[PDB]
Design a protein around this ligand. Structure first.
Ligand code: IPT
Ligand code: IPT
Ligand code: MG
Ligand code: MG
Ligand code: MG
Ligand code: NA
Ligand code: NA
Ligand code: NA
Ligand code: NA
Ligand code: NA
Lengths: 1011, 210
């Protein structure tokens, strides 16, 4: 039959989907959500054997363990065990596009387990086996007999084993196929793996059982009253003494209850459902659920008898909240939401796509700690525990169907084909049946990147009909089709339109007001955080706050999908596409996260946290105005700390408790600030601290901050005149200046400062030269490949123009002896094929105080692509432990990504000045710096800089961070100006005009001295 | 105190280079003990008779952004024509220069003055690389206006018919000029991108003979 090559067969003998069941036989255990003896986990050590195709599987395997098989842990992805290689491809399918066929060589994983079952389970009741996740299709055997078949790698497949089990030992035989017709609907941009990657368990329910139950909550106008309606369905023989009781609990307090016999209301001419009943409980002044305050109740569903005998009990956490779109706004409990979300794949560097509680909790804590309040399940239903945690910790969830056909041409070839409607319907309907009772889920998504087809419209309506409590969204086909209640574009820019044919990405502000449009707009994906990115993130949030209908979005994405590999020495390293022999592949495009695979934060995370703050501030005179963006909670665990400092030097500070109602405002009058003596700029820094710990944060957690420049007193005091005078020495090859034990040498042939001496020790390993390029960021590269060059990408434009090839040509180099100093004047021209790209004119003034003032004026040809930077660089012989600077920090920050950084005195170890992006590139820059200190060196001015043991050349020539090696001394890159990093997307130029170095003429000055 | 600011000399030195004389100066503008602006310049005069002027200005971040950052002087010369290579031919400002075109323009001096009934700063031309007037030529990248009326007379006269040509020609050469605004005329309307808020400014000019 080859059921894995037929979209018409997505399962055989599979049981109906339903909400989380545990079949408790004790009401109190159900109420407390404690373990159930009727729900057994089969996770642990199983027997596994890999085969190149289903036809290679020996028939004996059904009856007994294969002596060649290994004992492995389940759940797991067999690629993580090394049986075959994981494949990383973005859009292009990992297999030949020829629906519904798959490769004849179909990696097959044969799992098996010998287990025993409780005696009583064999004599009464129903015993089913549940596979929460099998990638991507499989056949099931029990004690040699065929049981069933199942598809869809992201939802549980259940089968009844009652007629197969026997006393003593039993044996399961699971043949998992890597490829199947289901693969055509699972083309998500992630590693392609396979196996039994989610829990496996046995559930024992009575013959007369609760087969399904739905919880709904409706409210009155001001949410002071609510009605909980619970529909309960049963299977088995109906008896007049049967009853169903639904009790609602708030802690150990029962707040409401309803009991009734089966027999629903009349629905049509043939009657009603005799096997169903709906209980309605009134709840006065319910505690409402939200991400701000995840108030939850406990609903216990008891199937019992009229005289008081319990047959079975199920239960779920209940969150009282209303989600609806009114007048173009998405409202949660009547208030317009502002989605601070992120897309999150289920990925672990060591375990692949197998999820665990520890990792899930870690992500949620980090997310809330960084001001995120929502998550999108990109791009499939998640491990069941995830929804539980979101319900309890408080995160708005977008539950998404496991449907992506990105690789088709056109993208909707399958989704507009009725032949594929059945397969698609199961991926949507079974998701709803499983998660419809989770309050954290507030929006349903029909899938991802599958164009727009009629099947989408059909399924959009199906959801609208069965569950009107949640809006339905889908981005495919233009982001505003008839299959979505929310305009949910991906990477639509703030002000810039991208008029693509048929599926344009309009500026988000413009999109909202297109003729006839009235829907809210929430980006399903934006700010592609690939490598050194998130430039321009602040632009989105400013728009979100100004426009009511722009209600946020989900950053792409949470964590780098890098995998761990080990070198010959057994040392681990982060690997990406192609590092497993997998080909074709899409290399580093699997790493687009705000945090590294091991959950270590990328510098971009702090920018997201800052822009996503829940408190806004304004300063006027001595008054600070705090505005709350919370919709439901009061600032009941917030303290405001304020600090005033003169160029890093703290002068005054204090703290005030925040007492702001949601959407409210609080005025804080700062005490009189005593005018500082010294000259300089006074800076005000405010930060909101949470004194008490929470379920997701430690005491002292900082949730928001902001800075303002206060009074500034320009220095008019002239420096103390020195007695000594620098002495100029000349030769045919160099200009040397001497002052005390210091010496500066300028090469007359190159026109650069080639050496400096402090006593007899050389200070430079490489001359101080202008630099106009940078080791290309992923955003600079885009999708440009050696075999497939994208002439439009910034890196290709710089290459074609000769920016990396340009050679400095000396035009002038002279020395003059002034009254109290020596003046070196130079001028260089950088050309490529007879074209002058840049011209640099400088003057170096070395005075009797030992300070060298460097003045730089650069000309950039208006027709050459704007340069990545305009500065100087050199390799210092010095290798110090610390880096101290007065400027923006402490973390890496760039022109279009520096709002989170604060101006102050920062001091960190040299290693912290380097950001370990898996794919090496320009990194570690810090902007708005007025003073830099390293070893005996001090540089002053107003510049940007990065300092490390890796040169731009090495970073630019190394594909993985583990292959980098510290060079001799330290490489210093001091820029007068630096280009934005961009990031609206990473496959097209995304650096906004205001951050491009297009002025044509640039000026900057530096003062180099010994401290 | 921008209109009252007094220039205080901080430094004035002279050096003799191999092929030129270098003059260095520094001034502080203050009002009631507050330093509003600091101007540091160098004047380099070579054998070609050209005077290269470099200007680097500091503006206190807490003082309201200044209307302009430039130089001015009253020339003894009164010429009939004004010739420049920059945006024109009509008056244009930073936030109102899209209509102007870059080219070689030559107009009678009177056309370099816009007769607004209520006198004010007027006649500026932006993005100018070369300006010619009489025996003078200024080169660089600046904005400028030139007329027989000082900024002082313009702001002290309520009607254009009461203006009187002063001796010589007043020249205002700006490295930078603030936008004029206009979204309305009863509240500040100059957009942020056209306000001089950089804190530190640099511009250079070359004064020589045409
Ligand atoms: C190849 C791009 C033009 S499509 C682009 O690739 C990205 C890779 O991180 C993400 O998967 C986006 O969702 C997808 O639209
Ligand atoms: C600092 C808050 C956002 S944590 C927030 O406070 C709420 C009370 O206002 C509830 O205690 C929530 O459970 C808690 O997560
Ligand atoms: Mg099939
Ligand atoms: Mg895709
Ligand atoms: Mg700020
Ligand atoms: Na909004
Ligand atoms: Na990706
Ligand atoms: Na508080
Ligand atoms: Na690289
Ligand atoms: Na006037």
């Amino acid at each position: 039959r080859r059921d894995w090559e037929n979209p018409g067969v997505t399962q055989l003998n599979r049981l109906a989907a339903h909400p989380p069941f545990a079949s408790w036989r004790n009401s109190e255990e159900a109420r407390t959500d404690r373990p159930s003896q009727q729900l057994r986990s089969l996770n642990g050590e199983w027997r596994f054997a890999w085969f190149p195709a289903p036809e290679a599987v020996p028939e004996s395997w059904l009856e007994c363990d294969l002596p060649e098989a290994d004992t492995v842990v389940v759940p797991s992805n067999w690629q993580m065990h090394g049986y075959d290689a994981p494949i990383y491809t973005n859009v292009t399918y990992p297999i030949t596009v020829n629906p519904p066929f798959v490769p004849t060589e179909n990696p097959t994983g044969c799992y098996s387990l010998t287990f025993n079952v409780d005696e009583s389970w064999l004599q009464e009741g129903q015993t089913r086996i549940i596979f929460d996740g099998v990638n991507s299709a499989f056949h099931l055997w029990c004690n040699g007999r065929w049981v069933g078949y199942g598809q869809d790698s992201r939802l549980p497949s259940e089968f009844d084993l009652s007629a197969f089990l026997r006393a003593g030992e039993n044996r399961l035989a699971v043949m998992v196929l890597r490829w199947s017709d289901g693969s055509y609907l699972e083309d998500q941009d992630m590693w392609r793996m396979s196996g039994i990657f989610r829990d496996v368990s046995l559930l024992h329910k009575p013959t007369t059982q609760i087969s399904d139950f739905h919880v709904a909550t409706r409210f009155n106008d001001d949410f002071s009253r609510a009605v909980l309606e619970a529909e309960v369905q049963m299977c088995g023989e109906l008896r007049d003494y049967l009853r169903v009781t639904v009790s609602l609990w708030q802690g150990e307090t029962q707040v409401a209850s309803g009991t009734a016999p089966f027999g629903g209301e009349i629905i049509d001419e043939r009657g009603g459902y005799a096997d169903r009943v709906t209980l309605r409980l009134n709840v006065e002044n319910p505690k409402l659920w939200s991400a701000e305050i995840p108030n939850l109740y406990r609903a216990v569903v008891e199937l019992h008898t009229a005289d008081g005998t319990l047959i079975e009990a199920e239960a779920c956490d209940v969150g009282f909240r209303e989600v609806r779109i009114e007048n173009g706004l998405l409202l949660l409990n009547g208030k317009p939401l502002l989605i601070r979300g992120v897309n999150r794949h289920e990925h672990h560097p060591l375990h692949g796509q197998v999820m665990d509680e520890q990792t899930m909790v870690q992500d949620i804590l980090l997310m809330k700690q960084n001001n995120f309040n929502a998550v999108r399940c990109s791009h499939y239903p998640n491990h069941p525990l995830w929804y539980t945690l979101c319900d309890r910790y408080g995160l708005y969830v977008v539950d998404e169907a496991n449907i992506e056909t990105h690789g088709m041409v056109p993208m909707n070839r399958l989704t507009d084909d009725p032949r594929w409607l059945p397969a698609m319907s199961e991926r949507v309907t079974r998701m709803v049946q499983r998660d419809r009772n989770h309050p954290s889920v507030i929006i349903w998504s029909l899938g991802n990147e599958s164009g727009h087809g009629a099947n989408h419209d059909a399924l959009y309506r199906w959801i609208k009909s069965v569950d009107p409590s949640r809006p339905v969204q889908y981005e495919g086909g233009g982001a505003d089709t008839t299959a979505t209640d929310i305009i949910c574009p991906m990477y639509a820019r703030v002000d810039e339109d991208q008029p693509f044919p048929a599926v344009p990405k309009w500026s988000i502000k413009k999109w909202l007001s297109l003729p006839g449009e009235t829907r809210p707009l929430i980006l399903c994906e934006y700010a592609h955080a690939m490598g050194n990115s998130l430039g321009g993130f602040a632009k989105y949030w400013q728009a979100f706050r100004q426009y009511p209908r722009l209600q946020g979005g989900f950053v792409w994405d949470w964590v780098d999908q890098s995998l761990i590999k080990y070198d010959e020495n057994g040392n681990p390293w982060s690997a990406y596409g192609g590092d497993f022999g997998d080909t074709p592949n899409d290399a580093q495009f699997c790493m687009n996260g705000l945090v590294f695979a091991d959950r270590t934060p990328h510098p971009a995370l702090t920018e997201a946290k800052h822009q996503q703050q829940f408190f806004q501030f304004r300063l006027s005179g001595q008054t600070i105005e705090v505005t709350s963006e919370y919709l439901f909670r009061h600032s009941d665990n917030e303290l405001l700390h304020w600090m005033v400092a003169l160029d890093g030097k703290p002068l005054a500070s204090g703290e005030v408790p925040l007492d702001v109602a949601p959407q409210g405002k609080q005025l804080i009058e700062l005490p009189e600030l005593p005018q500082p003596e010294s000259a300089g700029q006074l800076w005000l820094t405010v930060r909101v601290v949470q004194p008490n710990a929470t379920a997701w944060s430690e005491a002292g957690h900082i949730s928001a901050w902001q800075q303002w420049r206060l009074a500034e007193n320009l220095s008019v005091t002239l420096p103390a005149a020195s007695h000594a005078i620098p002495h100029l020495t000349t030769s045919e090859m160099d200009f040397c200046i001497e002052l005390g034990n210091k010496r500066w040498q300028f090469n007359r042939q190159s026109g650069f400062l080639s050496q400096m001496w402090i006593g007899d020790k050389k200070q430079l390993l490489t001359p101080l030269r202008d630099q106009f390029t940078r080791a290309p960021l992923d955003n600079d590269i885009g999708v440009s490949e050696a075999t497939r060059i994208d002439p439009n990408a910034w890196v290709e434009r710089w290459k074609a123009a000769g920016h990396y090839q340009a050679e400095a040509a000396l035009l002038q180099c002279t020395a003059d002896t002034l009254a109290d100093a020596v003046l070196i004047t130079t001028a260089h021209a950088w050309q490529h094929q007879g074209k002058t790209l840049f011209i640099s004119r400088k003057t170096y003034r070395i005075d009797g105080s030992g300070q060298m003032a460097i003045t730089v004026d650069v000309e950039v040809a208006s027709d050459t692509p704007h340069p990545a930077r305009i500065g100087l660089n050199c390799q210092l012989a010095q290798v110090a432990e610390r880096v101290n600077w007065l400027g923006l920090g402490p973390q890496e920050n760039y022109p279009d990504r520096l709002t989170a950084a604060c101006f102050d005195r920062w001091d960190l170890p040299l290693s912290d000045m380097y950001t370990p992006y898996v794919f090496p590139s320009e990194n570690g820059l810090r902007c708005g710096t007025r003073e830099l200190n390293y070893g005996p060196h001090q540089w002053r001015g107003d510049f940007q800089f990065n300092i490390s043991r890796y040169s731009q050349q090495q970073l630019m020539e190394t594909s993985h961070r583990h292959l980098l090696h510290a060079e001799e001394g330290t490489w210093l890159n001091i820029d007068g100006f630096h280009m934005g990093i961009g990031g609206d997307d990473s496959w097209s130029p995304s650096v906004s005009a205001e951050f491009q170095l297009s002025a044509g003429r640039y000026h900057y000055q530096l003062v180099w001295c010994q401290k």
